[PDB]
Curated annotation (Swiss-Prot):
The chain holds residues 1 to 114 of 277 of the full protein. It comes from the Bacteria. This is Small ribosomal subunit protein uS2. Coiled coil: none annotated. Belongs to the universal ribosomal protein uS2 family.
Length: 114
RNA sequence: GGCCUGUGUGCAGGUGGUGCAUGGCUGUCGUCAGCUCGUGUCGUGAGAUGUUGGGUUAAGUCCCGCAACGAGCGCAACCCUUGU
């Protein structure tokens, strides 16, 4: 089950890979074909994986787990920040901090100070 | 009991040695700005990061990105004097 249509996917252009100069060989099983130095990902595998992620996230919300949203690239900072704020869910989009969750005791005092 | 004159007794007395056993105190590097730790992470391991690189400063002063995030001792200032 998906909520995003194929035509919308192609219009968005999420099927493009990086150029042939920096492509990861491990993504051979996903990249479909090359066309002018650029790669294309297998859309059907994309929908299948999206479906699996959808079921997992549904299970997560079902048993009540908190999800952390992380993204630091310049382009998507505002998008992820707005989406996380609307969902009311912690996030970060400016700069990743060293082991904030792993070393949680130190950040605990930082939160109390805040 | 306070006292001291004599016999003692335990005992006082030593600038006598030993600053390569020691306390305390002190000179220097140098009033130079650097010096450590908690958590985590890389390696296995000595260890490293953090403290780096760009910029800036009298200074580890501050910003930038980074497996680093913070904390401690330093520095700045809090003392005195001088200048209205
Ligand atoms: Mg004597
Ligand atoms: Mg003697
Ligand atoms: Mg001596
Ligand atoms: Mg020194
Ligand atoms: Mg390990
Ligand atoms: Mg280090
Ligand atoms: Mg280093
Ligand atoms: Mg640093
Ligand atoms: Mg240092
Ligand atoms: Mg410096
Ligand atoms: Mg400091
Ligand atoms: Mg000071």
């Amino acid at each position: 089950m998906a909520v995003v249509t194929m035509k919308q996917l192609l219009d968005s252009g999420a099927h493009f890979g990086h150029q042939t100069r920096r492509w990861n060989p491990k993504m051979k099983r996903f990249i479909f074909t090359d066309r002018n130095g650029i790669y294309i990902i297998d859309l059907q595998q994309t929908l299948t994986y999206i479906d699996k992620a959808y079921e997992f996230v549904k299970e997560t919300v079902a048993h009540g787990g908190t999800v952390l949203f992380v993204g630091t690239k310049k382009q998507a900072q505002e998008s992820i920040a707005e989406e996380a704020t609307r969902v009311g869910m912690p996030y970060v989009n400016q700069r990743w901090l060293g082991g904030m969750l792993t070393n949680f005791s130190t950040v605990h005092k930082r939160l109390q100070r805040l």
